[PDB]
Amino acid sequence: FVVPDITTRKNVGLSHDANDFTLPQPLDRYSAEDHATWATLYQRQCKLLPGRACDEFLEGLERLEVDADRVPDFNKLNEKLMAATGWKIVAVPGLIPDDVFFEHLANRRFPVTWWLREPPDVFHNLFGHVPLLINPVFADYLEAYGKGGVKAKALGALPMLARLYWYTVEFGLINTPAGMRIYGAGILSSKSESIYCLDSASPNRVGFDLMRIMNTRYRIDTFQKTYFVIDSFKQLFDATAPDFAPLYLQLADAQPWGAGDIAPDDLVL
Ligand SMILES: [Co+2]
């Protein structure tokens, strides 16, 4: 049997723009159970993340006044985000087409799935992804990433950018004098990957390298086998400076690294 998935079920009776896929945040659809689920997830992550999340992340939660006890009102959050870096969040139904996603980031809009899991949802997207948007260097990286979507689409290279996004914005680590810390949203919203990625001898921790990353496969249904480590958000922004077109064409011919591979030139940590 095939039953409707959570995206389908949650969006019953709702609409979205056929071109940009946004909708007003449907506040009336959040039940008491939704707010309680949010509060439980927020409490869980805030207990586990000190000394694991990068300090900027935890500061962003506070500066944006991300609600601890209910699903946040996007408009209220936007008042703080806009004043900090000129970014805003927009509600979307769930996963959206790549060219739409890139167009949003290129215009300093961060798409956030509106609905919550039952006890890539609103907790993952808002709690995991949004706090670092108050950091001007990280925000500029996302904008530059977005702006690259047009060229990538024209060259059939969106999956090569998707690898960069996955291994930075979703699953990135940042080294600090106090020890390795986490900035990837997929880790920051996770119950246990937050532990494994810092504490386990199992995964590879490899120094950030743009070409290497864009040549690296990833898998979505398991903890990462490789994490890429930056020294600064400036390293991410600076990585977007050159022309990606000849990088894409070089990679198009190559065999990608597997998700668990170590490459000959890796700086291994
Ligand atoms: Co994500």
Swiss-Prot record:
Residues that bind Fe cation: 124, 129, 170
GO molecular function: iron ion binding; phenylalanine 4-monooxygenase activity
EC number: 1.14.16.1
Name assigned to this protein: Phenylalanine-4-hydroxylase
Catalytic activity: (6R)-L-erythro-5,6,7,8-tetrahydrobiopterin + L-phenylalanine + O2 = (4aS,6R)-4a-hydroxy-L-erythro-5,6,7,8-tetrahydrobiopterin + L-tyrosine
Keyword Metal-binding part of the UniProt annotation: yes
Native source species: Chromobacterium violaceum (strain ATCC 12472 / DSM 30191 / JCM 1249 / CCUG 213 / NBRC 12614 / NCIMB 9131 / NCTC 9757 / MK)
Subunit relationships: Monomer.
This protein's UniProt keywords: Iron, Metal-binding, Monooxygenase, Oxidoreductase, Phenylalanine catabolism
Keyword Signal: no
Needed cofactors: Fe(2+)
Pathway assigned to this chain's UniProt record: Amino-acid degradation; L-phenylalanine degradation; acetoacetate and fumarate from L-phenylalanine: step 1/6
NCBIfam families per record: Phe4hydrox_mono, PRK11913.1-2
Pfam families associated with the record: Biopterin_H
Family statement drawn from the similarity comment of this UniProt entry: Belongs to the biopterin-dependent aromatic amino acid hydroxylase family.
Database matches in InterPro entries: ArAA_hydroxylase (IPR001273), ArAA_hydroxylase_Fe/CU_BS (IPR018301), ArAA_hydroxylase_sf (IPR036951), Aro-AA_hydroxylase_C_sf (IPR036329), Aromatic-AA_hydroxylase_C (IPR019774), Phe-4-hydroxylase_mono (IPR005960)
Enzyme category, top tier: oxidoreductase
GO biological process terms on file: L-phenylalanine catabolic process
PROSITE patterns according to UniProt: BH4_AAA_HYDROXYL_1, BH4_AAA_HYDROXYL_2
